[PDB]
Amino acid sequence: AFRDARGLELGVGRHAMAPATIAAVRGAFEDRSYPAVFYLLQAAIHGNEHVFCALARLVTQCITSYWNNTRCAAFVNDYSLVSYIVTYLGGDLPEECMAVYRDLVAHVEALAQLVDDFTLPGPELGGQAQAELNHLMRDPALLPPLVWDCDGLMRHAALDRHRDCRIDAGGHEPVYAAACNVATADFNRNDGRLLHNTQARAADAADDRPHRPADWTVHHKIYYYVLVPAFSRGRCCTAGVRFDRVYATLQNMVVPEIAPGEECPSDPVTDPAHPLHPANLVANTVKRMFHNGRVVVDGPAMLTLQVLAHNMAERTTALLCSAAPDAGANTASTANMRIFDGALHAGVLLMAPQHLDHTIQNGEYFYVLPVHALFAGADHVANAPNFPPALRDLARDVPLVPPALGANYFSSIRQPVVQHARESAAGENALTYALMAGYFKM
Amino acid sequence: AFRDARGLELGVGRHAMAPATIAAVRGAFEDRSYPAVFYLLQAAIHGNEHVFCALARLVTQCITSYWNNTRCAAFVNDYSLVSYIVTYLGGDLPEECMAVYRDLVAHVEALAQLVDDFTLPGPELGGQAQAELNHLMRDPALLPPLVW
Amino acid sequence: QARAADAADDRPHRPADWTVHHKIYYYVLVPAFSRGRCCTAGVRFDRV
Amino acid sequence: APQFHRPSTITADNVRALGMRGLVLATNNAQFIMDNSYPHPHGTQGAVREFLRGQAAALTDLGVTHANNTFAPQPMFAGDAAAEWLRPSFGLKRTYSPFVV
Amino acid sequence: APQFHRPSTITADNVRALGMRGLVLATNNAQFIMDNSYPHPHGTQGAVREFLRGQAAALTDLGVTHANNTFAPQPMFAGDAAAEWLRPSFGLKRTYSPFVV
Amino acid sequence: AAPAGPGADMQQRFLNAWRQRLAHGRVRWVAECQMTAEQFMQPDNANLA
Amino acid sequence: YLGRGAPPLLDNAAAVYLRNAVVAGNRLGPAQPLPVFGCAQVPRRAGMD
């Protein structure tokens, strides 16, 4: 009741969301009927901007169907996607869901400029700014749970604080590459290679350089650590994704050949030349997966799904790296301390826990791996393909993060923030400023 | 008057159903004109998962035909059904009655978590959990009235 | 159960939450709507 | 062809050899008075057993009559497809209209 | 013709020479019994390396079959132009309807 | 812990090897359900010191 | 828990958990065990205002 009270203190005078754009997103997190093609596309795009504008008709139809299906938005698990839809899909969406996407992005930018209202200026200390010493989210010591590029580790690399980094699939030190092809890919590798191939141009690729400014990863950290516990209320998890299994069904498409001099099919039920006709619904290909979760896709929009061969990633990689306390917290009694942080080099945010569906088997595409207690949905853990039956009591009220990913005491964010997110009675505006102020350092 | 205000106490802070979707569900409990094919489908599906996606076309038409007549939801006597409508029939319904099934399920999961707030952690005692000793619903000693 | 391919004589198909989420429905939700005017029935399946 | 007011009559193929259209009508056009001159050998509840075994086989004959209208049944849920170790197994929500023009 | 119950059969050319439509049902009618007498020389994970070099290579072959349905690929993003000192490098949204009448 | 090998069974590496010491003793840091004046009191809060 | 005059619970794994959760910090919490013949002895705090 105190922690919400300073949120209302900060809530006035700066940007507040509509109650429309809250109910659109919070229903999208609690959508137990969620069509799972959006999870495969989230891995298919793999946070690469070039894959987004390639599939732009397919993305804007998957939303427009899902906006005609439900009064919920589609890609609100991935912040890069919510950025790209406002960026590259400004015209061709229904305008009720466009203001939902527009209000959700600027509310992050409201929270980013909350810190700069409070931070006094000064010199640079330990190679860090004044705000990076002040607030956690400007500070690149912490890095978000779901990272696709290598910008998040790069700014964590170039420091006087970092302990070099521990990749763990192969070798201790992480390593970067330029681009990935279908002959270059190794869909289960043990060498710790990190792909930097999320940028705009396929012609422009740099091995040791960032593609994006500092406002890219910070608005990611403000989205995942703050807005995701704000709406979801502790039913969410960040899984590792089998890319070789996900890619195997996307590119497996059955589109019937068009007749010479015939119109493009707009009717999914009536026209046999439509890929969503009942004749074309074949098991284990993508158009029936478009038919399982009911998504209106016409002819060429699933035909531009061949842009996985130009850009794809081989697999996901868990990540655990430490950092020293900063300049300004660095007396010799505290200098031997380490703060362990967990992340995923690829991986999606599961919005709604479900195992009652079996259009996809429980555990084919995703293994749950809660890297953080904020991203530990209990039902995701309690419905793994092997979960021990003696833990059905203990996992119900306790989050489960393995110590390969991090510990509760050695995380950047300890327990009661996870507790405060699921227990607070404030509105999602008033909780957000209550939890945005919780991330000022000590 | 004590017991009601006792539920006013716990009622804040956690999920309440919308007042719109109450009148949708309540109007099916008082529905004298209730068509009995829904009762014949309910004995048909009998709490199976394979039967439900067989009859998935029939159920989404019967509900939508029932939704156009009265603003109510017809399968709300059987929770094994209502969970399947939310899990399997997400797309092809008008979304207002889709939210009728969505909110009623989401009010149960808010009631399952209410025990976990109040039950303290502890060992298993007599082979049973702590919440199985605390509250009756997590306790398997009582069993539901219709067990398919 | 889920499939005809999965037939279990005593192996569990559903979690214990599937037993609890039903119990809350009939005991807690339903009498708050039905207002006591409801009845349980057995089914003559041969005639049904 | 059966006489539906005699319980000793119906075998499961007596229903199946009759069409579904006449299955309703010969059960609409039988006689009121139940005749007990020769009872069913398994008892009088054995006839209701023998009767419903044939209507389900009368539906599977009716499903063959729509084979030029219905499609090949895909598995409804996962866990059952041929190649599993290299690609996943789906399952299809049979929610569409199985229809051939 | 690759056999999807054997690990040491799937190559890149066996999947690419098979069509995109002919790879759907043939994998759907393979053997559930996986042979273990002759494994893949780079492991069973190395066959999953080799199997997806054949599907994605046939996506480019699918682009040849639909070259009369889509258009020439223009660059979506910036930094790429022949004449740069007098005009910049544009970038197109591909949010239209790719369809050739 | 250090992560090892593939990430797929890394949850499963956690669940099986820890289950004896995890399920037995109660965790200290779930004390959020403890109230305000139930914090500083000596009953049920031997974790005061 | 100072004075016994009643039977305990039958599950002794339940009885100690019910007893060591009350006793663990009271001003009137008993000694190490209770004696068979004797008294609970009610351990003294160091001061009182």
From Swiss-Prot, chain C:
Tell me where it resides: Virion; Host nucleus
Which family does the similarity line name? Belongs to the herpesviridae major capsid protein family.
Q: What does this protein do?
A: Self-assembles to form an icosahedral capsid with a T=16 symmetry, about 200 nm in diameter, and consisting of 150 hexons and 12 pentons (total of 162 capsomers). Hexons form the edges and faces of the capsid and are each composed of six MCP molecules. In contrast, one penton is found at each of the 12 vertices. Eleven of the pentons are MCP pentamers, while the last vertex is occupied by the portal complex.
Quaternary structure, from the entry: Homomultimer. Makes the hexons and eleven out of twelve pentons. Interacts with triplex proteins 1/TRX1 and 2/TRX2; adjacent capsomers are linked together in groups of three by triplexes, heterotrimeric complexes composed of one molecule of TRX1 and two molecules of TRX2. Interacts with scaffold protein; this interaction allows efficient MCP transport to the host nucleus. Interacts with capsid vertex component 2/CVC2. Interacts with the small capsomere-interacting protein/SCP.
| Name listed for the protein in its UniProt record | Major capsid protein
Q: Which organism is it from?
A: Human herpesvirus 2 (strain HG52)
Q: Which residues of the full protein are shown?
A: 788 to 835 of 1374
